[PDB]
Amino acid sequence: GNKIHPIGFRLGITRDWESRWYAGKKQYRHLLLEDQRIRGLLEKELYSAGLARVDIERAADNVAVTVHVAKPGVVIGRGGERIRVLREELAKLTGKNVALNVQEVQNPNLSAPLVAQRVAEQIERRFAVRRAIKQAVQRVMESGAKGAKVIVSGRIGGAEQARTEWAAQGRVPLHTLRANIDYGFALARTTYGVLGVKAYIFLGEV
Amino acid sequence: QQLQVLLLPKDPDDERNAFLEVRAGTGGDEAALFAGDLFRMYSRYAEARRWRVEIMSASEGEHGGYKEIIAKISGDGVYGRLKFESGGHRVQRVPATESQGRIHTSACTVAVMPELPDAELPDINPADLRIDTFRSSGAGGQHVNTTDSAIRITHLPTGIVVECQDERSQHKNKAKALSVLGARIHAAEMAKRQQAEASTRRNLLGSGDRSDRNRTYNFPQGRVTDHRINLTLYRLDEVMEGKLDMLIEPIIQEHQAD
Amino acid sequence: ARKALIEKAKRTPKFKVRAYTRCVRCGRARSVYRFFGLCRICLRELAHKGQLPGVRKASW
RNA sequence: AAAUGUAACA
RNA sequence: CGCGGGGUGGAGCAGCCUGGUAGCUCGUCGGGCUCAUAACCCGAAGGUCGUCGGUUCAAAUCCGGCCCCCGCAACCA
RNA sequence: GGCGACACACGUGCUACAAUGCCCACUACAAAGCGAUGCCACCCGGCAACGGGGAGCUAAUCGCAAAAAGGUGGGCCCAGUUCGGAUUGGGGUCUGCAACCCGACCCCAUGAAGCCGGAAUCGCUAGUAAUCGCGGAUCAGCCAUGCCGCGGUGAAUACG
RNA sequence: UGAAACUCAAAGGAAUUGACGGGGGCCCGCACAAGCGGUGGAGCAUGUGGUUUAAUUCGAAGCAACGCGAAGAACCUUACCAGGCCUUGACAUGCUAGGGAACCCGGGUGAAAGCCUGGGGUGCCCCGCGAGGGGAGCCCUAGCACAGGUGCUGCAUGGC
RNA sequence: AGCGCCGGCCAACUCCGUGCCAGCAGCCGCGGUAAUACGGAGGGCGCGAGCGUUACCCGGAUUCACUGGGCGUAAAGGGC
Ligand SMILES: [Mg+2]
Ligand SMILES: [Mg+2]
Ligand SMILES: [Mg+2]
Ligand SMILES: [Mg+2]
Ligand SMILES: [Mg+2]
Ligand SMILES: [Mg+2]
Ligand SMILES: [Mg+2]
Ligand SMILES: [Mg+2]
Ligand SMILES: [Mg+2]
Ligand SMILES: [Mg+2]
Ligand SMILES: [Mg+2]
Ligand SMILES: [Mg+2]
Ligand SMILES: [Mg+2]
Ligand SMILES: [Mg+2]
Ligand SMILES: [Mg+2]
Ligand SMILES: [Mg+2]
Ligand SMILES: [Mg+2]
Ligand SMILES: [Mg+2]
Ligand SMILES: [Mg+2]
Ligand SMILES: [Mg+2]
Ligand SMILES: [Mg+2]
Ligand SMILES: [Mg+2]
Ligand SMILES: [Mg+2]
Ligand SMILES: [Mg+2]
Ligand SMILES: [Mg+2]
Ligand SMILES: [Mg+2]
Ligand SMILES: [Mg+2]
Ligand SMILES: [Mg+2]
Ligand SMILES: [Mg+2]
Ligand SMILES: [Mg+2]
Ligand SMILES: [Mg+2]
Ligand SMILES: [Mg+2]
Ligand SMILES: [Mg+2]
Ligand SMILES: [Mg+2]
Ligand SMILES: [Mg+2]
Ligand SMILES: [Mg+2]
Ligand SMILES: [Mg+2]
Ligand SMILES: [Mg+2]
Ligand SMILES: [Mg+2]
Ligand SMILES: [Mg+2]
Ligand SMILES: [Mg+2]
Ligand SMILES: [Mg+2]
Ligand SMILES: [Mg+2]
Ligand SMILES: [Mg+2]
Ligand SMILES: [Mg+2]
Ligand SMILES: [Mg+2]
Ligand SMILES: [Mg+2]
Ligand SMILES: [Mg+2]
Ligand SMILES: [Mg+2]
Ligand SMILES: [Mg+2]
Ligand SMILES: [Mg+2]
Ligand SMILES: [Mg+2]
Ligand SMILES: [Mg+2]
Ligand SMILES: [Mg+2]
Ligand SMILES: [Mg+2]
Ligand SMILES: [Mg+2]
Ligand SMILES: [Mg+2]
Ligand SMILES: [Mg+2]
Ligand SMILES: [Mg+2]
Ligand SMILES: [Mg+2]
Ligand SMILES: [Mg+2]
Ligand SMILES: [Mg+2]
Ligand SMILES: [Mg+2]
Ligand SMILES: [Mg+2]
Ligand SMILES: [Zn+2]
């Protein structure tokens, strides 16, 4: 058990923080806690939409939450029905002016956290884990990625002996700083236990 | 709660001090290792009740433990309490003598017997002797032909006879005859005594040494299960690394109802 | 004894000594950083995600 | 010139 | 019953005769080496000298009595 | 109340057994950090811990802050000592609702082992080892001689 | 010359991939050597084995467990022990029925918790010059689902 | 309307109980707290006034080889 997290390894090189603001010693914690509660609520409510990234900004008493998603409509609703419903649920928790945006995920099959959650859904539906993994990688490469690697660990198929299955195509140079690699993790809860899913998408090097 | 009158069956050797010996079984030095684990457990239990546990013979294990270990536990109600340890205790654990790392089912055996120190019963009571003075046989002179001085004694209760015809006088021939008669009385009674030891231990230690009675001590799960009755607790360490009073007690409570 | 303890740690005590930091994320009582409100494990988990503003792997 | 390591691998 | 030899740490033996000092080997124990055991290395503990009496300033030692052990003898009719 | 027990056993460390040293006085030279019921200048009371006053600083401004080894001068004279600072008695300080079990610090007295360590064994190839101090996280306080950092001084040796 | 009883689910040939060799060749690493400073001995600090204990909570086990989880155990922490207590409960989502909501303040008993109580004014949209009639802002009491478990299995697992 | 069977050979799978126990077994093998292999149940497969078992004969066995085998190292060249 070794490998470093591929995003934290690229923070400020190929990947940018998800909470971009400044705060002083006396304040940092409380903003961060509220920041995570925003993600807590949104991660549950926006799952069906296709949540990929949740960016957060702060100035002074006002905060702007940018939600990236594959199905923008599922967030907005009918003419703004759910999008309005969100600000109220939001600024109730926030207690401040909570500006909520939405933005497209141009290619959900090039978004690693999306690929990961899809396979995790597939394996909670009792699908053939190995067939799924080869498929997921096949989608990501067809969508143009320079390389892809997907991993599933746990009681695969219900087996008592845990195992790890992975498949990969193209290049995935996890040692190269300048290589842009999206990473995502998805938890698959089954009747026999938890399976872990990891998705690596190599978009290109910068 | 109407306490059921348990004062109907009597018991002779129920409060007497008890010998306790633990012997290794199936599984090489692993069972020897466990025979010490059973002995410390009975040592924790004896000292927890202010009992005198005194070892008299031990055979060390090749890699630590006890192939055999016999001790004398003295106190009040010793045998009447530990007499349910006699039998085969089964083990299931990851050995300390393991190379790969797999569960191994070894076993040990425990013998528990009362005190009843052996008596002497000697000095040959004469009222059971029939002394026969006659004449000798072989070399000599007129003395042999005439002087008798050939002796044979007969112990009626055992049937053991001895005649001595070595030296001339019958009194020096009776002296040897008396001492030999008692030597045969004692060697014959000491036979009937140690025959009763190997005949009771054989039906208490269980010749089979892997699948027999008593308890099985599983360490991976944490299950001490005594198969005699029908109760499987989870103390294990608590019972082993310490005393185990509330385990013997459900066995005695069911044996009472029997 | 866990959720009751992450709860008793929130309520103000009978004497100000009895107050102690728990990790707001996982409830850990040990190795709690004041600056974040998080334990060393959560501090590492969120930092690798990038959900700690300005925090990055320090190398010199 | 120097001995040994039993007995329950998915 | 005679004669003469013995009993000294857990085991096997010294030390007595020319009295003051009980020692050797194994074992036991703590520490090392080794993945671990043995082997090996370092350090240590351990003896009412069979019991009862006495000669002596002083007894494992010398002198008596008892208790066990070993060997020999017990012939002439 | 216990996690702090104590016939014993092992690991990791701290301080040492001293003169290339110890003590006292005076005097230099860092870095990296931390700090608004926080860091505290300076003043006064106390041998002191500390206390009472009180300025500054949302800190390249103010503060922790003196770095220590070193340098200069004096004392010690080879001794279980002016080495060593364990153990215990007594008297206080601070934190805290509360220091019996079970806190750190100061002061008076006490002043143990230890004279360089068996079998065995660890680290390090250059600003390294060795040695010297400074900071931080945790944190009311602290059992930190621990950990993560920071600079000062600065070697030996590598045939193979 | 040459059986049988009995017993086993194999005994075997060659070749393949490893692993190992007190086989060989060629290399590398503070691995040895060359050096410098230590550990093992002392006193102490700390972790552990043991033993002790009502409890001395638990995990970590050769290198790669042992100043490791513990980057702060007097209460708290705390998972252990003793004793005093609470029963939809310290905490979530619920439906139902009674109080008044909500918040703040004391009294009694007690080691405290708790148990027992004496205080005080509820917005709303509402018939409201009127008793009076609510909804649901939140609490309180009774209930039923449920909560809660640092209880076991790292040999069912994810993550690290 | 009953009997055998439902791990592989070999056609027919799940729940519970059990927890190297009780037991199954023709071979290989099952059972140590998620057992399609033990016991029951539901369901399924195969036959049906029968269905299974034991025994014995030929077959599969080109495993006594005439059809139709072999002997350097697998059993097997006699010492010449
Ligand atoms: Mg024997
Ligand atoms: Mg004759
Ligand atoms: Mg005559
Ligand atoms: Mg006559
Ligand atoms: Mg509890
Ligand atoms: Mg939990
Ligand atoms: Mg605190
Ligand atoms: Mg804390
Ligand atoms: Mg001799
Ligand atoms: Mg002799
Ligand atoms: Mg020893
Ligand atoms: Mg005498
Ligand atoms: Mg003498
Ligand atoms: Mg003659
Ligand atoms: Mg306590
Ligand atoms: Mg502890
Ligand atoms: Mg203590
Ligand atoms: Mg030691
Ligand atoms: Mg040490
Ligand atoms: Mg230390
Ligand atoms: Mg001194
Ligand atoms: Mg002294
Ligand atoms: Mg000296
Ligand atoms: Mg050495
Ligand atoms: Mg030093
Ligand atoms: Mg602190
Ligand atoms: Mg202390
Ligand atoms: Mg420090
Ligand atoms: Mg071969
Ligand atoms: Mg080969
Ligand atoms: Mg080699
Ligand atoms: Mg080295
Ligand atoms: Mg190097
Ligand atoms: Mg060396
Ligand atoms: Mg040393
Ligand atoms: Mg030491
Ligand atoms: Mg433990
Ligand atoms: Mg545990
Ligand atoms: Mg522990
Ligand atoms: Mg280590
Ligand atoms: Mg406590
Ligand atoms: Mg408590
Ligand atoms: Mg484990
Ligand atoms: Mg594992
Ligand atoms: Mg894992
Ligand atoms: Mg059939
Ligand atoms: Mg199966
Ligand atoms: Mg068939
Ligand atoms: Mg089939
Ligand atoms: Mg059973
Ligand atoms: Mg199982
Ligand atoms: Mg089951
Ligand atoms: Mg079945
Ligand atoms: Mg079957
Ligand atoms: Mg018919
Ligand atoms: Mg038939
Ligand atoms: Mg046939
Ligand atoms: Mg034929
Ligand atoms: Mg032919
Ligand atoms: Mg053939
Ligand atoms: Mg041959
Ligand atoms: Mg051959
Ligand atoms: Mg020939
Ligand atoms: Mg021949
Ligand atoms: Zn945490």
Contacts of A25 in chain C (CB under 8 A): 35
Asked if residues B134 and B163 have their Cβ atoms less than 8 Å apart, the reply is no
Alpha-carbon separation of residue B129 from A88, B132, B224 (angstroms): 117, 10, 59
Using CB atoms, list chains with 3+ pairs below 8 Å to chain A.
C
Contacts of C36 in chain A (CB under 8 A): 28-29, 32
Interface of A with C (CB under 8 A): 5, 7-9, 11-12, 15-23, 25, 28-29, 32-33, 35-36, 39
Tokens 């957060």 label which residue? A56
Nucleotides of D under 7 A from a protein CB: 5-10
Collapse the DSSP code of A53 into the 3-class scheme (helix H, G, I; strand E, B; otherwise coil) and give the result: strand
Burial string for C37-50 (b: 16+ CB within 10 Å, else e) reads bbbeebbebbbbbb
CA-CA distance, B127 to B153, in Å (whole number)? 12
CA-CA distance, A45 to A40, in Å (whole number)? 9
Collapse the DSSP code of B235 into the 3-class scheme (helix H, G, I; strand E, B; otherwise coil) and give the result: coil
CA-CA distance, B250 to A113, in Å (whole number)? 58
- The partner residue sitting opposite C50, judged by closest CB among A11, A33, A39, is A11
- Residue B195 backbone dihedrals phi, psi, to 5 degrees: -70, -35
Contacts of A68 in chain C (CB under 8 A): none
Of A8, B233, B84, the closest CA to residue C55 belongs to: A8
Residues A159-165: contacts with CB within 8 Å, 24+ apart? Answer: A165/A129, A165/A130, A165/A133
CA-CA distance, B104 to B94, in Å (whole number)? 6
Resolution at which this structure was determined, Å: 3.2
Residue A82 backbone zone (phi > 0: left; psi -120 to 50: alpha; other: beta): alpha
Crossing angle (nearest 10°) for helices A112-124 and A129-142: 150
Tokens standing for residue B256: 């009472």
CA-CA distance, B189 to B122, in Å (whole number)? 11
Tokens 């950083």 label which residue? C33
The single-letter code of the amino acid at A108 is P
Contact A9 C57 (CB under 8 A): yes
Of A97, A102, A166, A171, the closest CA to residue A134 belongs to: A166
Asked if residues A20 and A31 have their Cβ atoms less than 8 Å apart, the reply is no
Q: How many CB atoms lie within 10 A of CB B187?
A: 10
- The shares of helix, strand and coil residues in chain B, as percent rounded to the nearest 5, are 30, 25, 40
**Helical residues (DSSP H) of A67-159, grouped into ranges:** 72-76, 81-94, 112-124, 129-142
CA-CA distance, B212 to B195, in Å (whole number)? 24
Q: Does at least one atom of strand F sit less than 7 Å from the CB of C37?
A: no
Which domains, and CATH codes, for chain A? 16-106 (3.30.300.20), 107-206 (3.30.1140.32)
Distance from the Cα of residue A79 to its chain's centroid: 26
Q: DSSP label at B174?
A: H
Asked if residues A72 and A48 have their Cβ atoms less than 8 Å apart, the reply is no
Alpha-carbon separation of residue A65 from A19, A69, A93, A181, B151 (angstroms): 9, 13, 13, 24, 123
Contact C37 A35 (CB under 8 A): no
CA-CA distance, A21 to C51, in Å (whole number)? 11
Q: DSSP label at A156?
A: G
Q: Does C15 appear as a known binding residue? A: no
Asked if residues B205 and B23 have their Cβ atoms less than 8 Å apart, the reply is yes
Residues B175-180: contacts with CB within 8 Å, 24+ apart? Answer: B177/B151, B177/B152, B177/B153, B178/B124, B178/B153
Longest dimension (CA), chain B: 92
CA of residue B56 to ligand 27 center, whole Å: 44
Which domains, and CATH codes, for chain C? 1-60 (4.10.830.10)
Of A2, A8, A16, A3, the closest CA to residue A206 belongs to: A16
Distance from the Cα of residue B25 to its chain's centroid: 17
Strands (E), B177-250: 215-218, 223-226, 231-233
Collapse the DSSP code of B19 into the 3-class scheme (helix H, G, I; strand E, B; otherwise coil) and give the result: strand
Resolved by:
X-ray
CA-CA distance, B207 to B214, in Å (whole number)? 14
Tokens standing for residue B231: 């109760």
Q: Does C39 appear as a known binding residue? A: yes
Q: Does at least one atom of strand G sit less than 7 Å from the CB of C25?
A: no
Residue B172 backbone zone (phi > 0: left; psi -120 to 50: alpha; other: beta): alpha
